[PDB]
Amino acid sequence: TNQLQYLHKVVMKALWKHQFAWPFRQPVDAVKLGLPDYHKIIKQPMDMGTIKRRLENNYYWAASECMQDFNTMFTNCYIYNKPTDDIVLMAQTLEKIFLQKVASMPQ
Amino acid sequence: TNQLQYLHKVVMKALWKHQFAWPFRQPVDAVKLGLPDYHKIIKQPMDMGTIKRRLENNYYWAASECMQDFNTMFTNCYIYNKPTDDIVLMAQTLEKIFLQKVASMPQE
Ligand SMILES: Cc1nnc2n1-c1ccc(-c3cnn(C)c3)cc1[C@H](Nc1ccc(Cl)cc1)CC2
Numbered sequence: 444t445n446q447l448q449y450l451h452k453v454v455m456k457a458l459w460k461h462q463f464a465w466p467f468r469q470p471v472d473a474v475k476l477g478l479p480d481y482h483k484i485i486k487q488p489m490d491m492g493t494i495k496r497r498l499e500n501n502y503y504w505a506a507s508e509c510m511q512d513f514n515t516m517f518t519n520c521y522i523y524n525k526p527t528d529d530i531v532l533m534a535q536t537l538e539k540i541f542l543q544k545v546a547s548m549p550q
Numbered sequence: 551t552n553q554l555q556y557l558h559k560v561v562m563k564a565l566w567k568h569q570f571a572w573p574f575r576q577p578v579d580a581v582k583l584g585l586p587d588y589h590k591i592i593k594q595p596m597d598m599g600t601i602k603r604r605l606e607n608n609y610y611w612a613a614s615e616c617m618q619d620f621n622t623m624f625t626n627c628y629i630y631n632k633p634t635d636d637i638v639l640m641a642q643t644l645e646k647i648f649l650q651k652v653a654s655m656p657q658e
């Protein structure tokens with residue numbers, strides 16, 4: 444759809460190259476990070492690599508479905524990490540760009 | 551603006567009357583709730599009452615400003631509360647409606 448192309452080529456492109464984006468470009472690897480509680484706390488993991496693949500393989504039926512995945516990725520970050528962790532500030536910054544760009548999504 | 555009317559008549563109307571909205575209709579009251587660390591963790595409190603008042607009083611200059619306030623309100627909840635707190639599920643339910651409606655907001 445027009446909106447899904449916008450989420451792909453405008454929103455995600457902006458978020459993907461951001462300097463705070465690197466932790467979000469692939470799934471959280473709890474083994475490599477030594478976080479054995481991650482998947483006990485976060486039951487719906489999400490990341491931009493997954494969203495991007497879904498956009499490219501036409502997995503989404505509506506823009507809102509893709510926006511829901513972005514939201515899950517951000518709220519997973521807030522739920523799991525300590526308030527004082529840098530990753531929380533990084534997610535907040537990216538999330539604000541997400542909403543800013545979503546406000547201009549063609550309708 | 552066209553977008554701000556939409557946020558007011560479609561988004562806020564939908565969230566304000568929701569059965570899970572009541573904890574979000576007023577600022578978090580850390581005395582009433584016995585939460586002496588709340589304002590040490592959450593530096594930008596936000597709530598639906600405030601957003602609703604800002605919409606009514608033409609406080610916002612752009613729709614993204616109003617959307618950021620909704621976002622801050624939900625994010626505060628995810629950051630402050632324990633993962634297993636019911637209020638997190640309530641916030642998630644309301645935010646999904648927020649995103650669903652925002653997906654159809656006018657473009658200008
Ligand atoms: C997003 C997100 N949400 N929850 C978490 N993650 C996350 C995803 C990836 C990486 C990582 C580390 N290395 N690589 C190649 C990737 C580290 C984290 C977090 N830890 C963290 C994040 C940023 C910094 Cl600067 C230091 C530690 C803890 C788990």
Ligand SMILES: Cc1nnc2n1-c1ccc(-c3cnn(C)c3)cc1[C@H](Nc1ccc(Cl)cc1)CC2
Nearest residue numbers: 572573574578579583585626627630631636637
């Ligand atoms: C939003 C939000 N973000 N952080 C918090 N809040 C929040 C706002 C209002 C009320 C409240 C309680 N009573 N009144 C009249 C109002 C309770 C809470 C949370 N506590 C809570 C929430 C739901 C349930 Cl079912 C039980 C306890 C903890 C603090």
